[PDB]
Symmetry: C3
Subunit: 357 residues, 3 copies
């Protein structure tokens, strides 16, 4: 049945409620224009599924254990991904072989073979149950495994030179929704630039060479301590780009932080270290290995971003929401008009028609 | 033109439609108060961009191949990240050298040199085209590469002791929106605690030491089988925290599962294994290597979470949505009033004014 | 006070505005039925927190440096995760030892000891400050470190055979919201299938064997060049599944691309390479190593997806939004009726009641 309903309406002409209503409407409109559209950029589509690729390479040489250490000695793993370690401190145990020997840590002290049992399984290898002489002063439980066991009585030095190593970060990102590609290596970067650019998160965001010490400082850490305990530093690269502006306005934002925050607050586990071994065998069949306890700084490059570009659909939908919402003022203007205008009684009479039954 | 419109309204006074309308309104209000605000916590802002850091360390010793294996023998890779493997089974091929030799697998059986060609490229090295004697009973295609080739006729044992290794998980998380930091190592964790805490997802979520066997059990797996085939276990740590409550109420939730689910359902690929080599060279220039086929359990620690905290903006917006929505009952109350109240005719007459032209 | 308000309404009976109003309503309804419900599937819940597991294994043998290279020689790292490298080109420096020696790169050319200082820290080891003879024609700064240093005067060949290696991808995914599990290895995959299936993103998405050369081609790259410079290829596996259809309708979508896009656009850094060393020691205590500069293709398997399944809550909410929105046509029908129907004056008179004071 083709019939169109529309409500009968009172049309007050008082100047007060006119200005007040037009004012409330102007406030709604201004809120949508200023906050929903400008600040929150509701007029554009957003891409958050950013595709990122990170390739890294470290350079620098250091003196440690009276030997020169280069990238292949101190960076692990070696494949140049977004997570890698620069080893800044080591505890080395040369020429371990499978056999029997006493633990060196005082935590394994024994006077009699009775104390050597399941109560102290952690560390070294498997206990024999015997109690043996580590030195003339100390006696410890005998173990079968890699011998001799490691010793941690005196602290080893750090590789101070590591503060001066360089990290090359080649980062490529793409917002697929807009088919947009950019990286921190601009296409006009020259060999000279690589030789002389000085990275700074504000002054030069497109220099791909970062000094380790600078990264540690930006993260609010003291290299002397971090290199002693080890830790984890995050290099966050953010691509928040407004594709309505120029390609050259899309700029990476570098943040630096320490990620293993629980470590600084903990007396039981203060840094980051791990153990690995170099494996050898003699001309004879038998095997031997060097055990290494490495302390270092773990870097992981975390890439995030979102892009926005003007689109008609969201603009239409959002403006429709604006116009639909401009009406909401009628509840306020109604309270005011019907209850606080000294002419309220007349308006209440004209607006409401009571009914009974 | 400062003019304020408002609609003329009928004001029924029937008790039935009064109670029914106030009831529908109470139902809307109660739905918003109970579901939108309480259950869905629409009164608070949410942070989902959680920053997580995971450091791991394994401890334990085992007997395998009549040698003691420690962390550096059986964990790979070694850097203590959120993904690592404990090797529970091995197939070892000692002292391989570059040369010529016959394949040992029956899948390469040949009677004549004709059968040795491109049809069987997988495995070993490059075929010479010749057919040679592996043993007096079996003959196989000759290959050039690492010799001798590996053999898989009889199954090797697993490292049962691995069920007893321990995994140390130091996890640090931060919700940046609220500048909130916490980890599974509480600041009051003591050396005694580390020596004696018993991890349980409910009874002790802040014990950082997890027993491998316990992890395998929580994931509904049988260590005896998993260690034979290899597999992938996920340790999920969830931080779902209501920052309106106390910091100490923010607690990690551990889940355990097997991630390579396709493996249990497959007859062709049942677990997880990989090959690597230890490289050596003699006093002579020539090189030789030990080849290793490792079966093990891959652990990856997956950290997720979201935080919520009271904020005024979303509370205002949501309550505005509540009041705006309370009106929607008028369509129902209209159907009822106008069509099912026995006094309907009068109301239809008072409400509608027909027009023609 | 149990009172029910309802507005007094004009009820035009003109056929024109009847058809026009019913038409606008039909357009709103059709927009919701066609776009909000069908295309955008607003009638179902969505799971985006997909759980994915990837296990990889490479197979193939190649000839390089007149030796046969198998998986343990050219894949790194070895643990078969979703990111791995196939090494396609190498620069080998045999039997390095700690000592003194001259740089070989012309970039370190010196005539006098004065030029050997901090200005050229990158590369090799630590400068002694002396200027020494590399050859009768060239002189370079002496360094202390691993000797001899590497040389890059003539380009080494690539491992062409790598185009023919195979990548086994076992991918298991689970949408937890719907407790849905599936992988690219179907449970009915047979050894024959593994021996003979030919992967294609459209014709055979469930073949888990991918030929390296095919992956390089799908990513729009030339193996001859990529294997020379190195690079990063992404294998994206997308699980976009409508759980209202059959389990067997849930199919993976393979995409291939090159992720280090900045490399092709850059003259300073064109590919992907990294350095590592094989470590040895003689019967004597002293150590020596082989240094390797590896160029290769990095593959990382990126798994994404979202699942949707019918649910009552979102259907109710969305249909409620449809009916609520069907009214919005009244502003348009009002403009038309009140201003463009030649009978407008009568309607304006019936609808509006002016008031003054
Ligand atoms: N898997 C594990 N099982 C039991 N205890 C562990 C484990 N991993 C670490 N720990 C203990 O937790 C504490 C902190 O570990 P952390 O690695 O930070 O210090 P550490 O002195 O390097 O430990 P260690 O030298 O024994 O490897 C130490 O007492 C350490 O022995
Ligand atoms: N890259 C590849 N190319 C061809 N076939 C492969 C590849 N990777 C694995 N396969 C085959 O898929 C099947 C399952 O592989 P899986 O690694 O689970 O078992 P496997 O017995 O350890 O295989 P293998 O011992 O040959 O490495 C095996 O038949 C294996 O040969
Ligand atoms: N950590 C770093 N510090 C300084 N320069 C670097 C660093 N990493 C790479 N570079 C330089 O950036 C340029 C591009 O590096 P890339 O690795 O792509 O090429 P390359 O020729 O393999 O470099 P190299 O052979 O010196 O390792 C080269 O000139 C290289 O020396
Ligand atoms: O500037 C190039 C850009 O123009 C258009 O975008 C507008 C944008 O909407 C405005 O906010 C303004 O600040 O920037 C542009 C006007 O110069 C389109 O995005 C497109 O045509 C083009 O990329
Ligand atoms: O507004 C962006 C919009 O993009 C897509 O919508 C497309 C649709 O995919 C096409 O079929 C086309 O015909 O209509 C739309 C044109 O923009 C997404 O499907 C949609 O989710 C997204 O909002
Ligand atoms: O309790 C400390 C906390 O108080 C405030 O939060 C309220 C919260 O809104 C209530 O739901 C209640 O359950 O908890 C708190 C009242 O004790 C604020 O969040 C803030 O002042 C403070 O952190
Ligand atoms: O409601 C949370 C809100 O936080 C931010 O809004 C800020 C804004 O960034 C500031 O400029 C400030 O002046 O106004 C708001 C105060 O909360 C986010 O911009 C916004 O997206 C988010 O909703
Ligand atoms: O088909 C099995 C499936 O049926 C139901 O889903 C409907 C779906 O809503 C329709 O769009 C249609 O295309 O597919 C199904 C009708 O065959 C339920 O999802 C459930 O009972 C079952 O899984
Ligand atoms: O519509 C999906 C819905 O799922 C969950 O809602 C559940 C709720 O968790 C249960 O307590 C149950 O009693 O009520 C709902 C039944 O679907 C989520 O809580 C909610 O966020 C989600 O929308
Ligand atoms: C170690 O042996 C020495 C002599 O061999 C002697 O001092 C003592 O018996 C042992 N040490 C301890 C602490 O018992
Ligand atoms: C870092 O290098 C500069 C010269 O490039 C040198 O002056 C400084 O001492 C170095 N720092 C350390 C800790 O060696
Ligand atoms: C390289 O191009 C970018 C892109 O606009 C520009 O900002 C930069 O100034 C250019 N570099 C030089 C040295 O001109
Ligand atoms: C091999 O010879 C070394 C001495 O050079 C000896 O220490 C080792 O025990 C021998 N092992 C075997 C198995 O003969
Ligand atoms: C292997 O050689 C032996 C003797 O050298 C003999 O049995 C036979 O010729 C070969 N084996 C087969 C299966 O042909
Ligand atoms: C694990 O350790 C306990 C003692 O700590 C021992 O009783 C048990 O036999 C061990 N399990 C295995 C499989 O060795
Ligand atoms: C450590 O602090 C947390 C934080 O409230 C608390 O729950 C726990 O009981 C404390 N531990 C001890 C041993 O008091
Ligand atoms: C090196 O010597 C060993 C014997 O010790 C021999 O097997 C090998 O073939 C020799 N290789 C070369 C290149 O001389
Ligand atoms: C290298 O030494 C040779 C002779 O020892 C001689 O040609 C010259 O002094 C040196 N080369 C240069 C370029 O000076
Ligand atoms: C790849 O293998 C086929 C046979 O399987 C062979 O014809 C082709 O030459 C190989 N490609 C290369 C580059 O060796
Ligand atoms: C294996 O099962 C899937 C699931 O429906 C099916 O699509 C496929 O055709 C099956 N394979 C064979 C060989 O029947
Ligand atoms: C070890 O012996 C080799 C010769 O075989 C010699 O080159 C090296 O300098 C020696 N090193 C030491 C520390 O004796
Ligand atoms: N301002 C509102 O949310 C009122 N809405 C109606 C509603 O969703 O309840 C108008 C609309 O968006 O169509």
């Amino acid at each position: 049945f083709f019939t169109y309903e529309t409500p009968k309406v009172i049309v007050v002409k008082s100047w007060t409620i006119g200005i007040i209503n037009r004012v409330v409407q102007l406030l709604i409109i201004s809120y949508f224009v200023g906050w929903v559209f400008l600040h929150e950029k509701a007029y554009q589509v957003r891409d958050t599924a950013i595709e990122s690729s990170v390739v890294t390479k470290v350079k620098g040489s250091g003196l440690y254990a009276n030997r020169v250490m280069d990238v292949s000695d101190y960076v692990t793993p070696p494949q140049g991904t977004s997570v890698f370690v620069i080893i800044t401190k080591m505890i080395v145990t040369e020429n371990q072989m499978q056999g029997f020997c006493p633990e060196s840590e005082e935590k394994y002290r024994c006077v009699s073979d009775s104390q050597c049992g399941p109560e102290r399984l952690p560390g070294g290898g498997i206990l024999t149950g015997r109690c043996v002489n580590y030195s003339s002063v100390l006696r410890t439980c005998e173990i079968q495994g890699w011998c001799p066991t490691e010793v941690d009585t005196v602290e080893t030095p750090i590789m101070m030179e590591a503060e001066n190593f360089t990290i090359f970060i080649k980062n490529s990102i793409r917002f697929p929704l807009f088919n947009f590609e950019k990286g921190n290596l601009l296409p006009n970067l020259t060999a000279r630039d690589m030789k002389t650019c000085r990275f700074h998160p504000d002054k030069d965001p497109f220099c791909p060479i970062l000094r380790v010490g600078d990264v540690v400082k930006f993260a609010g850490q003291d290299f002397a301590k971090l290199a002693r305990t080890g830790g984890v530093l995050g290099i966050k690269i953010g691509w928040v780009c407004d594709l309505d502006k120029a390609w050259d306005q899309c700029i990476p934002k570098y943040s630096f932080t320490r990620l293993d925050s629980v470590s600084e607050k903990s007396s039981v586990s203060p840094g980051y270290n791990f153990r690995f071994a170099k494996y050898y065998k003699m001309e004879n069949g038998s095997e031997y290995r060097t055990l290494l306890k490495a302390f270092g700084i773990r870097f992981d490059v975390l890439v995030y971003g979102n892009a926005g570009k003007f689109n008609i659909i969201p603009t239409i939908i959002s403006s429709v929401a604006a116009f639909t919402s401009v009406g909401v003022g009628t509840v306020l203007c109604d309270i005011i008009l019907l209850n606080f205008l000294k002419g309220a009684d007349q308006y209440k009479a004209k607006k409401f028609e009571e009914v009974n039954e």
